[PDB]
Symmetry: C4
Subunit: 387 residues, 4 copies
């Protein structure tokens, strides 16, 4: 029967290692697939890794050129937790270069976009069969979250953007039930530009922290109500800026406007916005996708002067990071939802020029109410063995 | 309980990418099997890829010579949708160099032919055990559809041809129930020569678009009634000729005779013949198996002057195609049958001489009532990496 | 519930290809295990391939020396029908260099022997746990059938030999129920020496055709009654001699004595002994394990002048064969038991010196009441690609 | 429903080969993972192999350096019995460089420790989700058993040590029920230092034979009562010393004190302590982890002069051994618990310098009431093929 967001977030006093696949390490001498834009997603019975294959192995010759995002040979694949995405164990969800996926309690919905930049289309799959199709409205790179959606009593909303990446675009929230469209609505609120939303849900409310690609160093937030099927957007108020690249943290920041300083760029990220129980993730570098850390900034969403009270380094500044996004095991035992996240560890091009490919591996963490010691969790591949 | 063709075809206003395995790309550095003559086929619970293995990997040395059709080391294998047919994940159905396969609702029937050209035999398997055997009647290359059959309340007919390929031959429609022969009957109607039939069924009627190898540039059609166990054949009337090689489209074409101009050659193909809701597939080239496209030609079967009103390019003329065939997920949700098809993308010999093998990959599409933008879906392997 | 041999043998008017794995072909560029002494065995729900691994891949370096039979790194593995025995898909049954295995209807019993030649022991496994252990009685290479046993209402007898191979030895029939020993009894009847028995059962009777290694060119037969738990032995009377090596067929042969002419050698083989419905298998060569054929010799067991009335060549004399043995799918649909068999196709040492290993692949056939044309089914590997 | 230790140990009159994976042999030309610290563990339905991956294949280049114990790329993986731990078949349990795992009857609990040496933490997983977290108390390499725990009516105790390895440390027995902490208690009794406990349970009592790393050549024993949740410790009295390195066996030994002679070193080991039905395992070498043997020393725990009455060599002194530990199939049929154990066969560094890695394979044995002949069970890899 349909899942229903009835619990709230547990208290996050630190983070524990949840998953880690060591793909590029293992892929130096194994049949692992070149992938990117990963995420994690739970069924009622198991949690899995997810990514867009590039349709080639890392050591395969057809890996030259996989710095490229959109092509005919990309796909949404998933595999067992903490395994590497191999040729022999990966399951294909749908064909496309942009995706999102979520179980509703009864079964799983998966969405893939393919197409030329000016004539793309989404095919919504539900219970492993195609059900609904949508075409470019703005006709400039139709695209979704690149991480899991969230459902509540059968309704699962998904944010798409179609249009420019360095300007005004058209974003829609679609509300699906059983893979079928219930309704959709243009973006509302004060957010200026929306990309790659990272979502979670608790107490019958869904929160997505997204990416303003053309203006904002602070991150927009869509809050969604899955029962009334309406929404609104804003920016995180805090001065602890969490996009990349970004300027340095000011002492005061914006609540309803992009904080300026870098244009036309960002990375996928997330946060858990929960009163004083609020944690933001970010690359440590402001210039580069390097390092990763979590920061406890009470009332970040609302308090425009808020600054960190506690923190945890996940990846050292010397180590390459990348995209990141939220997920929770909604069918786990317990009185509250335990917050989890993942970081994509990009390897290869552009920063690592001596190779001709671009891949990644995954580290995943979840919260603890304990205060656990911290380690750092690098990819751990040695680029020189690929030469 | 037995499946019953009770729905009709949905409205096809365009086609969406359904499946794609990228085998030859992935097989440059993975243990993928050399195969050909693929197809797709659905059980009640999952849809799979199917093909005739050549009993060797692509990079394996025993791949030299796999331009050859009939040998002791060929087999019908199936694998998970959109995976590549690998050594470690493929399931063997039966041993043979010609096949067809279909689930009847209760369980699956698979048919393989093996033998020397003059002493071949079919073994009908049902629920993974061998049940019934048939011997060459004409004693010249007993052969079947090379794509899935169709059932209705337990009866699943299959078209075989035995005899010459460049002349009069003996074709039979066998009607199986539970893997056992109910009846068979010689070919009837006006079709002159029958090979490799592509079949679908709706509203308790089965339509196969086949291949006249010795005369026809227009395609013969067998219509089958699974309740009365009778049939009849014809040719598609339209002048939009859909075999290969073929002459150019005239302004008027044949309904009960082969349209002349090329002898003793063709390729497997298909169509969905549904009033104005009619779509034909073809190679774009008339000379070569190059490119692929779908064309909307209302009343093609009956209207001998019919010409296209809408179209979709699937594979660009610069890209190699090959066989193609129909399938539908008869156990999918919905009020109508959503039409699907697949194209075999041949690589290697004969057209690509620098390698000593011949393999292929698969693209598969299904219909949408939407009007989706179009992309082209090439194999995407780079023949030079095999050198 | 326990299986009960209640049907009789179908009429065998010819043989159809049942299974074929092409392992050595595929193993030239895949991770396939060096094996030997294969067989086939059916559960209620699926039929599988079985063999003794040598604990190395064919292309692996540790394959030098696998001409050797008994070592610490051998095991009974099984795998899906017609796949090759690969590292990633094979299931280990037990550890040993001699084996037999059979499902009793409720679950499967598997028996492996390991040890030094003078201190060997059998461990009987039942439902994948070890249950019963037996030690060398004669203390000279304890050994079993190397093909599947047969059960009836829970009782499954197994023939072991312990002792000399070129002389008098001690053979016992053990009767197991639920993996536990019910009873055992020394060999009886007129057979002089027993090795590697190939067994089948019909109408509550079990027939094993075995191998007299020190004297007989004609094959001994143990007939077993699974209800009374007694047995008796004999030789096949016919002059169509079916061991190897062997002299030429005389016009008259022995019923209760070894036919003389070659000493201290043989190969595993089988027959189906059923009135006029009797078929014997043999290598075509008398000198070498070359070629394979089936022969219809009515009343072979009893009629000491019987000579062939029909035949089928399975492997041409120019192609290497090896061991062979019987099996039937006792849970198949139908009024009679359809007779099946397999041939081991040995490759490498001794006959093929340029390589340093010894492996094999499998062809398997079952009967038809039809008269099917015949093909020949060689291994099909090309020894020169291993150089 | 929860498992309940209600049977007692069967009579062990000898040992039979239970499992053997030949990983390093097979890993010379297959995608097998570098691992160490293995063990075996049974679910209600199957028994599996377990080990800490090093996140690389043996032939992979990232295997240089895997002599190292604690890193970010290690994990607890399990795989099917007697298979090798491959990239494509291994299941990841949790992320860490120290572990233990046991099914309680209802489902399985797995515990992994990760961290820097001074800020480590345990995450207790239960039914494949994380549930409970514990932090370093002594802040010097938090560590567990490196072999399976044991449960009784839902309570499963686990021994951890935190502190120095060559001195006084802090050891705790935690008692888990449903993955949650019931209670814990500091170490008690006369044992001086505790590491890597090997545990079994019979008649509602749990016995762990552990390792005193700084003083004892004789092995400490924790006996645990899972109903009262208390414990006590001691040393095995016997003079047949079973650590390594160790001095030579005296004629008399300690019951409540470490027997002196080697400092600050040992290996994981085990024993089954059962009146006269008592068997100890040990390396044959006193200097080196070489060879392995079992010894029957009646009343070893209590009788401080006890010396062997029977024995079995498992691995010859010329062959490398390593860790060892106990397990039993608590859900096996029968009136008593059949005692099993495993030996880790280390290959590579330190003793085998010409390679740059360190891996192992597994041999596993269980008891028989029979008196079975003995074989020796070496790794069987040939280090020269890795050069
Ligand atoms: Ca930005
Ligand atoms: Ca033609
Ligand atoms: Ca003989
Ligand atoms: Ca010690």
């Amino acid at each position: 029967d349909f899942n229903n967001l009835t619990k709230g977030l547990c208290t996050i006093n630190s983070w524990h290692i949840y998953g880690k696949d060591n793909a590029v390490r293992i892929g130096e001498d194994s049949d692992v697939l070149v992938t990117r834009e990963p995420y994690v997603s739970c069924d009622p019975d198991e949690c899995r890794f997810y990514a867009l294959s590039q349709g080639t192995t890392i050591r395969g010759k057809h890996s030259n050129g996989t710095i490229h995002d959109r092509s005919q040979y990309r796909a949404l694949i998933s595999w067992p937790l903490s395994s590497p995405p191999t040729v022999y164990n990966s399951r294909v969800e749908c064909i496309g270069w942009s995706s999102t996926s979520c179980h509703d309690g009864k079964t799983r919905m998966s969405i893939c976009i393919s197409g030329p930049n000016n004539n793309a289309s989404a095919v919504i799959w539900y219970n492993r069969r195609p059900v609904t199709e949508i075409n470019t409205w703005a006709r400039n790179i139709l695209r979704t979250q690149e991480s899991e959606c969230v459902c509540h009593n059968g309704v699962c909303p998904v944010v798409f953007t179609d249009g420019s990446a360095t300007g005004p675009a058209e974003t829609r929230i679609y509300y699906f039930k059983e893979g079928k469209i219930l309704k959709w609505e243009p973006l509302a609120g004060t957010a200026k530009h929306i990309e790659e939303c990272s979502c979670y849900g608790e107490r019958a409310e869904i929160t997505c922290t997204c990416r303003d690609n053309w203006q904002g160093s602070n991150r927009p937030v869509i809050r969604i109500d899955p029962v009334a099927m309406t929404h609104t957007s804003q920016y995180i108020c805090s001065p602890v800026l969490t996009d990349n690249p970004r300027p340095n943290d000011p002492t005061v920041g914006k609540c309803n406007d992009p904080y300026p300083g870098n244009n036309n760029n960002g990375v996928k990220g997330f946060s858990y916005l929960d009163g004083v129980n609020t944690w933001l993730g970010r690359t440590i570098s402001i210039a580069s996708r390097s390092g990763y850390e979590m920061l406890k900034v009470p009332n970040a969403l609302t308090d425009d002067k808020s600054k960190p009270t506690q923190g945890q380094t996940i990846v050292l500044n010397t180590d390459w990071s990348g995209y990141s996004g939220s997920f929770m095991d909604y069918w786990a035992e317990g009185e509250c939802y335990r917050a989890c996240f993942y970081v994509e560890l990009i390897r290869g091009r552009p920063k690592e020029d001596k190779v001709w490919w671009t891949s990644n591996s995954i580290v995943s963490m979840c919260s603890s109410t304990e205060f656990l010691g911290q380690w750092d969790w690098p990819d751990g591949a040695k680029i020189e063995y690929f030469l």
